[PDB]
Amino acid sequence: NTFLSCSQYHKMYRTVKATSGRQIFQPLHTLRNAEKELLPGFHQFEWQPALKNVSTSWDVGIIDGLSGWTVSVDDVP
Amino acid sequence: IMSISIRLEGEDDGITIFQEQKPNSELSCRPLCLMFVDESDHETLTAILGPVVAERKAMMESRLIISVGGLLRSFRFFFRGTGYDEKMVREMEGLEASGSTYICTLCDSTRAEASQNMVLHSITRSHDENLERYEIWRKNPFSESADELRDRVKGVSAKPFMETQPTLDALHCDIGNATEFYKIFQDEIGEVYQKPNPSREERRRWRSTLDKQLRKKMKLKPVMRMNGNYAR
Amino acid sequence: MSLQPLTAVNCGSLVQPGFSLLDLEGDVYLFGQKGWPKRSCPTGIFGVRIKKGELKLRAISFSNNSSYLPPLRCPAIAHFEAQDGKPECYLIHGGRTPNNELSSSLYMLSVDSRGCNRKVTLRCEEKELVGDVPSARYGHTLSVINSRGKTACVLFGGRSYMPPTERTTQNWNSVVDCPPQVYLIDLEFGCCTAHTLPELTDGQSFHVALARQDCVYFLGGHILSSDCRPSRLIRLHVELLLGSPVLTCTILHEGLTITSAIASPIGYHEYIIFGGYQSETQKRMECTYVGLDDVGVHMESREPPQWTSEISHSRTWFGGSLGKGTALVAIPSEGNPTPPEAYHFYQVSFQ
Ligand SMILES: [Ca+2]
Ligand SMILES: [Zn+2]
């Protein structure tokens, strides 16, 4: 929410930890793992009826928007 | 997500459970697709956006089951497609662009017949019948002329591909009106109905004296384009 | 056999890598403009004029008796030769629309009047096709043949989207070769008939064809399932032994390894073939001439004109046949600023 960078965060965390005796800012890997729930593609659900010509999975995250183009340079690239 | 209401189990014409308070400030605007393309070239935009259209069309009927608060519950959906620029409005609607003669997006009168009477029109446009009119265009079952069919079918020339309720963009809604009052005053300084043709600079001289007039009383510097501030 | 660079006068944002050229009665017409028809031309078809290297495009009009054609991208062109009943026609089907939906609807184009001032009026009639219909596809090939003496048409090749069984919204823009069945089209009426042959192992696409005297030859192209571009020239011979169009074909030894070629007919059955791409990485650079007769294909390698260093070193390109030894090649130019006219055009001429 304040656009802070990542190595930024770890340096800041080193600072606050070493400074005053307490663990105030949660470290990196636990941060990412705790965050991973909030992105799309985490929570199992169901659909009645099943959708038309749509995949059955629910875990897939960021799909490449190319949408599976045959890279063959004969067609429009 | 604009609003979630309740339905169980009688008439429930409306029981708002959560109606979003600040639906404009971007802190409620979730992005879902991004492409390094331009707004103009219909080609790549359709080519990528297609899948999302298929999801739209496949979702509106079937119903969803989600485990929330320990309870597995059902969910239905509508869709109100508004967030498009007028250019994109008619582009997704397939209609001509942009300074055409079929100015409206819900009535089908042209420029002039809308100029005759202003406040007497009924809303007709909807995605389905625009699809229908395009089909009539394509088959052309009456061997009509170019312009004759163009008029009879109400300027439908390209198969639209995303149902959007063509609602007014509240944002500008004034800039045309602002410059219209500007023109009213520019033709009020110069007595118009006695002299039906102001000259090249007479119009500009009238705008100049009007500008220093409103600089005298309301103190507004000469502006080029009627953005929000000056218009308000 | 030489190139001359041209200059794009105007309307430079109306040509795209996929397009076609209908050459007929002098004035030749470009079909397949990018984007939906603009108001400057509700037809979309343009008439192309060349004057001291200047490439101008005028907005051809329509008839009144005519239906209106969306700007299809890569249909199968077939010059329906001038004869009974109404000379002379161009068969177009079916390509894919600017919105990625395919036509699966045959179209036929003809000329009506002129000028009075050089103006060549046109008409575009849909001919409904019943069957046993050909499936919607793109990049395939259509041609005309005449058997004792009745005239029919032949369709073959082409890829398509996954049928609406596993057409999934993450593979929603993938393609697969259509099942290789040639289709036989009667123009009157469109009682299309499907046919097969155990020699039609698997259907390839982008393969320019050549028909003559009720015998056709299919040249090199590109197939995906094996990812190879095989060099097996194909011939087929049909006979309209009514009420059966009974067919056979034959493999040949040598077929060139070329895709998306620029075919200019010079003589009776003399075709100078430029060839677009040798393999999926290296463009085809040189030229080719093919004669044909009952003997068969007579290959030859003519003089390749020295392409300029820029076109020599560009990755890809395209073009069309200006007809009669003349042709147009277009190269996507990379440079700042994008004018947006980022396309260079060379007029190539044989002899
Ligand atoms: Ca805009
Ligand atoms: Zn209206």
Side-chain angles (χ1 to χ4, degrees), chain B residues 39 84-88 172:
Chain B
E39 189 168 28
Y84 310 84
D85 323 318
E86 325 88 334
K87 168 206 296 183
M88 181 135 298
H172 334 107

Side-chain angles (χ1 to χ4, degrees), chain B residues 104 106-108 121:
Chain B
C104 184
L106 311 103
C107 171
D108 313 48
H121 314 288

Side-chain angles (χ1 to χ4, degrees), chain C residues 108-147:
Chain C
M108 163 172 50
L109 216 164
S110 157
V111 55
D112 171 82
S113 94
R114 74 165 77 182
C116 62
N117 171 262
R118 324 268 162 181
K119 149 198 179 37
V120 192
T121 68
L122 298 181
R123 70 173 310 157
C124 326
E125 307 224 313
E126 152 163 8
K127 234 62 171 63
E128 191 285 327
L129 293 199
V130 79
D132 209 7
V133 317
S135 52
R137 53 190 71 198
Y138 74 130
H140 63 327
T141 37
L142 191 91
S143 287
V144 197
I145 38 75
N146 324 277
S147 296

Side-chain angles (χ1 to χ4, degrees), chain B residues 41-43 46-48 50-51 54-55 101 134 137-140 143-147 149-150 157-161, chain C residues 16 34-37 39 42 63-68 70 73 96-101 105 107 126 169 172-173:
Chain B
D41 45 357
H42 194 95
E43 221 305 310
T46 319
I48 288 311
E55 303 296 339
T101 326
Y134 167 94
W137 165 286
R138 210 188 59 68
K139 264 139 57 185
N140 191 337
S143 91
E144 319 179 357
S145 99
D147 292 346
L149 164 70
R150 166 185 212 276
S157 95
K159 180 187 185 184
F161 90 118
Chain C
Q16 33 174 0
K34 169 225 279 185
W36 285 98
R39 183 54 188 298
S63 99
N64 294 338
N65 325 67
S66 36
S67 147
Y68 281 61
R73 194 91 57 90
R96 63 177 179 165
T97 43
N99 324 327
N100 314 344
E101 61 192 284
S105 36
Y107 281 138
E126 152 163 8
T169 88
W172 206 72
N173 301 49

